[PDB]
Amino acid sequence: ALRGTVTDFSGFDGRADAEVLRKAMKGLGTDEDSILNLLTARSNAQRQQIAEEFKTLFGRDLVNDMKSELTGKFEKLIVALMKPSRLYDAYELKHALKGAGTDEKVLTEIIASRTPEELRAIKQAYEEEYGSNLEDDVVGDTSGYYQRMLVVLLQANRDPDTAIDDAQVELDAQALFQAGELKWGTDEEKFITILGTRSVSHLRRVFDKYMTISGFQIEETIDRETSGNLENLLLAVVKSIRSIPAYLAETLYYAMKGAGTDDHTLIRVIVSRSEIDLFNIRKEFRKNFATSLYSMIKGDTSGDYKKALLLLCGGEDD
Numbered sequence: 001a002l003r004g005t006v007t008d009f010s011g012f013d014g015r016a017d018a019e020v021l022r023k024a025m026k027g028l029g030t031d032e033d034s035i036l037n038l039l040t041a042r043s044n045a046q047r048q049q050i051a052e053e054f055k056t057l058f059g060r061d062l063v064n065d066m067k068s069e070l071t072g073k074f075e076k077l078i079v080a081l082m083k084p085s086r087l088y089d090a091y092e093l094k095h096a097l098k099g100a101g102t103d104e105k106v107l108t109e110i111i112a113s114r115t116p117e118e119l120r121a122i123k124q125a126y127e128e129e130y131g132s133n134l135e136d137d138v139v140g141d142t143s144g145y146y147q148r149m150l151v152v153l154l155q156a157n158r159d160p161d162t163a164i165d166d167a168q169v170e171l172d173a174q175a176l177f178q179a180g181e182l183k184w185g186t187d188e189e190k191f192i193t194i195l196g197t198r199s200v201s202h203l204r205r206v207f208d209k210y211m212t213i214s215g216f217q218i219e220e221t222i223d224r225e226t227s228g229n230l231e232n233l234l235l236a237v238v239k240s241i242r243s244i245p246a247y248l249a250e251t252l253y254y255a256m257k258g259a260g261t262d263d264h265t266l267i268r269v270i271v272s273r274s275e276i277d278l279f280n281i282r283k284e285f286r287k288n289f290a291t292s293l294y295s296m297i298k299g300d301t302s303g304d305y306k307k308a309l310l311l312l313c314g315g316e317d318d
């Protein structure tokens, strides 16, 4: 079953919480410990409630006050923690599309790992919040098959899980084989239709059969046949089909990979999944990397930032 690491706090008193926060910031300096200890122990819904209580009591904006009092990565984490759950993905996508450049990894990460219901919710929130259509903006900042696959995924029309059809599994596996390894070049359109619209249960069967037929895992063929953002997107899609938790766990691993850390990604994953499947992510993480996610973060981060991340993540055993 899917499980997160953050849940509603029992005996929740938003008014009292707003007072704690006001006390942590009022006056010289800031009580960062008090702030993180509280917010990481409250669900996203409760945080929004605290924000309204804070404003009702003081006429001050909670998030604006924390941005004034805080700084660095700790601030970025607190700000993300404050973003309403329903708007967070839309927010990160908007951030990925701002300016002339484009943050492809974010578009790929979110669009490949969100369910059709989540994408429908995101598309709506995005347009309501920014006054523009998500698909349109994505199309505007992307090109080629990478763009097309993203558009297919944005339609949020992946087939639901229905009775498994053996002939169909064989048919699709063989089709991918002819579209890639057996073709001079690649029939990208076939990979996009099959990997982007077929059901999760169907594709899991297809991946197994594909290996049996070709001798290659679908991930290997993808690397052999494609490159650029298309390659990254197809891998993310395949990995999410196998296991969203596993994909995100791997996403975290390569974010604390080597000199320095990809904090933007580290924060987004921890925050976005904290109330969905961060627990599952932890398990898949421990199994695949022989170390708990906790240890990874602990040795890659520091300060209040580190403290907050560790409280949200949890599972120091694992």
Ligand SMILES: O=C(O)C1=C[C@H](O)[C@@H](OS(=O)(=O)O)[C@H](O[C@H]2[C@H](O)[C@@H](NS(=O)(=O)O)[C@@H](O[C@H]3[C@H](O)[C@@H](OS(=O)(=O)O)[C@H](O[C@H]4[C@H](O)[C@@H](NS(=O)(=O)O)[C@@H](O)O[C@@H]4COS(=O)(=O)O)O[C@H]3C(=O)O)O[C@@H]2COS(=O)(=O)O)O1
Pocket: 001, 002, 003, 161, 162, 163, 164, 200, 201, 202, 204, 205
């Ligand atoms: O009790 C739980 O453990 C549990 C309960 C919750 O409902 C759910 O958590 S939730 O937070 O999402 O609410 C979660 O459900 C598990 C489920 O218990 C697992 N069952 S087990 O594998 O037998 O142990 C499992 O179930 C899914 C299977 O993985 C999936 O197989 S495959 O796609 O990987 O090949 C299988 O899919 C069926 C599908 O349901 C059928 N639909 S139909 O309406 O009958 O047509 C149809 O499409 O066939 C496929 C394949 O059938 S076959 O496997 O018999 O050959 O069944 C799925 C399912 O029943 O949900 O995983 C879920 C989710 O796991 S997770 O931990 O939340 O990630 O845990």
Ligand SMILES: O=C(O)C1=C[C@H](O)[C@@H](OS(=O)(=O)O)[C@H](O[C@H]2[C@H](O)[C@@H](NS(=O)(=O)O)[C@@H](O[C@H]3[C@H](O)[C@@H](OS(=O)(=O)O)[C@H](O[C@H]4[C@H](O)[C@@H](NS(=O)(=O)O)[C@@H](O)O[C@@H]4COS(=O)(=O)O)O[C@H]3C(=O)O)O[C@@H]2COS(=O)(=O)O)O1
Pocket: 025, 026, 027, 028, 029, 065, 067, 068, 069
């Ligand atoms: O004399 C005091 O009463 C007083 C002095 C000290 O500076 C400080 O006490 S201390 O013990 O902490 O050292 C405390 O500062 C008050 C400040 O006087 C208040 N100003 S008031 O609204 O006019 O009463 C208020 O300040 C906040 C206001 O939004 C604004 O202040 S002001 O210039 O209008 O007077 C200012 O807003 C900044 C914002 O903080 C910035 N944030 S960011 O980090 O850069 O992202 C940014 O958004 O710019 C705006 C606007 O700047 S502009 O004015 O130059 O255009 O600062 C706000 C703030 O400091 O939070 O509250 C503080 C703190 O009050 S508390 O009761 O201790 O919590 O009191």
Ligand SMILES: [Ca+2]
Pocket: 024, 025, 026, 027, 028, 029, 030, 069
């Ligand atoms: Ca202060």
Ligand SMILES: [Ca+2]
Pocket: 029, 030, 031, 032
């Ligand atoms: Ca301090």
Ligand SMILES: [Ca+2]
Pocket: 066, 067, 068, 069, 070, 071, 072, 075
């Ligand atoms: Ca700041």
Ligand SMILES: [Ca+2]
Pocket: 096, 097, 098, 099, 100, 101, 102, 141
């Ligand atoms: Ca852009």
Ligand SMILES: [Ca+2]
Pocket: 101, 102, 103, 104
């Ligand atoms: Ca780029």
Ligand SMILES: [Ca+2]
Pocket: 179, 180, 181, 182, 183, 184, 185, 186, 225
């Ligand atoms: Ca080929």
Ligand SMILES: [Ca+2]
Pocket: 185, 186, 187, 188
């Ligand atoms: Ca081609």
Ligand SMILES: [Ca+2]
Pocket: 222, 223, 224, 225, 226, 227, 231
């Ligand atoms: Ca390649």
Ligand SMILES: [Ca+2]
Pocket: 255, 256, 257, 258, 259, 260, 261, 300
């Ligand atoms: Ca590192």
